[PDB]
């Protein structure tokens, strides 16, 4: 039973748009598809997003059928230049199994700590195959797990890192053919 303490894997890093224009609207939104490996963003500005090709990130994108628990950790690193007394920002986090607006939320959080905060919670994959689930498959109208954010005042709550930890019971089967993963720099 392979295991080691304190070793998560980086999954994504979303940087709020630098040219966000407060005057148009005050918040902006992005969503991370935890099991499919994609990041979605606003047309609110030029987002700087990135999905790291870490071991867990590569595994999930290529594992056809999944089942079991995963651990999620979100770390918001904000604008250190704002004085603590002028902090006027908050971010709403949502866990939904689909991006469709017709699906209710599995969970919901709202974080507003100044400069930085972290959020850790587990998610579990349950599917119809044999408890296995295929990412957004049309088969039994399967689904995924999306983590959506509504950042209010993107100039203070600027950065988000999403890390994932695999559990002892995570189990997969089958392979999904994917195009080459692009290596940065």
């Amino acid at each position: 039973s392979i295991s080691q303490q304190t070793v998560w894997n980086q999954m994504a890093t979303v940087r709020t748009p630098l040219n966000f224009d407060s005057s148009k609207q005050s918040f902006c939104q992005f969503s991370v598809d935890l099991l499919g490996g994609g990041i979605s963003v606003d047309k609110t500005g030029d987002w700087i997003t990135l999905v790291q090709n870490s071991p867990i990130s590569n595994l999930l994108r290529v594992a056809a059928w999944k089942k079991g628990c995963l651990m999620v950790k979100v770390v918001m690193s904000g604008n250190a230049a704002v004085k603590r007394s002028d902090w006027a920002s908050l971010v709403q986090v949502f866990l939904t199994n689909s991006n469709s607006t017709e699906h209710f939320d599995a969970c919901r959080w709202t974080k507003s700590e100044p400069h930085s905060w972290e959020l850790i919670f587990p998610i579990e994959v349950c599917g119809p195959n044999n408890g296995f689930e295929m990412w957004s498959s049309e088969w039994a109208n399967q689904t995924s797990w999306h983590l959506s954010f509504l950042v209010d005042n993107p100039k203070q709550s600027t950065t988000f890192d999403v890390l994932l930890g695999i559990s002892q019971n995570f189990e997969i089967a089958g392979n999904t053919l994917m195009p080459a993963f692009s290596v940065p720099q």
């Binding site: 080691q4 594992a63 295929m134 997969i172 053919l177 994917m178 195009p179 080459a180 290596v183």
Partner: protein, 370 residues
């Protein structure tokens, strides 16, 4: 006088059963041009589309039965003379997203067979399209995206007179489906890896042509500013260090007319190509018979003193690499009366009695395969 409709056996939920003729569901004819080159995709489509060509005896059963328990069995057929050769691969994968890679490395991890028609003129393969369980169905195959790629791994050694055609007969097998799942932090024994190690080419002549294949196989296969990746290789990359009895499957992908004795052994990256006593290390000599195309090498874990890194920084040099390598070199010479290099393909099949330590944070990128 009145028949009782209810008593009729019209709702029989049983799986298809019978002889091969009775269980034949489809037939595909794949075209193989005389000028095919290797890397060439002969046909890449949804499996459901291959299983749906032609109205054979069990064709409407395939379409009208909700659960099929037999595996899918295919019988590929095509013969070519001994003075030529080509290596074909028929690969099966659970799903596909976008313009996925068709490289032999990416496609051969689930259920895939590589054969050389100059040696094997009829090839059979059976598989379970649903690894999580013991049954499948045509709807499941369609809505799930189960994929099939038939590619040419190595082109013709000598081109045929005319164009060729490979015929594949598809059947529902009598053997039942069995699941194959991977518990990431708890590998089974043996661990089924199915990682392509590379395509080795040894040009005709007296040259040694030393080949070095790193055993730090985590992180996928390198590509141009990208990495290729398949599921089993992805799970092995989760661990930090590993060891095990390694089993390689070596295939002759070239014509039976190009002879060569290859020598395999384990050694470190820093040895010069001209090291005289490479063969003082435990080694194995491989020669193929005319019609023989597959050989299985098994490297015991006593060839390894310690577990090694699952992943090494891609730019690491041969001098600074501290992980073992699988070497391959020419023992005598690569000779023939027709032009062409002697080419073999190496695939790390399973790892037995494996032992892994720690979790891997990950290293960015990976080295290119052969």
């Amino acid at each position: 006088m009145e028949t009782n409709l209810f008593k009729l056996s019209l709702d029989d939920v049983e799986t298809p059963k019978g002889s091969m003729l009775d269980l034949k569901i489809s037939q595909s004819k794949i075209a193989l041009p005389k000028n095919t080159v290797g890397g060439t995709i002969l046909r890449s489509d949804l499996l459901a589309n291959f299983l749906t060509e032609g109205n054979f005896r069990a064709s409407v059963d395939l379409q009208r039965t909700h659960r099929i328990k037999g595996m899918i069995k295919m019988v590929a057929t095509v013969g070519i003379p001994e003075n030529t050769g080509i290596a074909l691969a028929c690969a099966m994968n659970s799903s596909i997203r976008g313009r996925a890679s068709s490289d032999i490395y990416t496609i051969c991890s689930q259920d895939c067979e590589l054969w050389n028609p100059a040696c094997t003129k009829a090839m059979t393969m059976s598989f379970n399209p649903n690894p999580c369980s013991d049954a499948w169905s045509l709807e499941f195959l369609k809505r799930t995206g189960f994929h099939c790629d038939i590619i040419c791994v190595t082109g013709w050694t000598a081109t045929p007179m005319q164009d060729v055609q490979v015929t594949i007969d598809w059947f529902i097998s009598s053997q039942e489906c069995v699941p194959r799942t991977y518990c990431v932090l708890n590998p089974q024994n043996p661990f089924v890896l199915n990682r392509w190690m590379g395509k080795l080419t040894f040009p005709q002549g007296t040259s040694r042509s030393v080949k070095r294949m790193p055993l730090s196989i985590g992180g996928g296969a390198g590509a141009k500013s990208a990495i290729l990746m398949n599921m089993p290789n992805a799970v092995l990359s989760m661990w930090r260090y590993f060891v095990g009895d390694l089993v390689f499957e070596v295939s002759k992908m070239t014509s039976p007319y190009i002879k060569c004795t290859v020598s395999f052994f384990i050694a470190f990256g820093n040895l010069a190509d001209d090291t005289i006593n490479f063969e003082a290390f435990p080694h194995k000599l491989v020669q193929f018979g005319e019609i023989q195309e597959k050989v299985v090498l098994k490297f015991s874990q006593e060839e390894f003193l310690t577990a090694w890194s699952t992943q090494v920084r891609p730019a690491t040099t041969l001098l600074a690499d501290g992980c073992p390598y699988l070497y391959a070199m020419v023992h005598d010479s690569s000779v023939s009366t027709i032009p062409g290099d002697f080419v073999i393909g190496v695939k790390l099949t399973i790892i037995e009695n494996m032992c892994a330590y720690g979790l891997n944070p990950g290293i960015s990128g990976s080295r290119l395969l052969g």
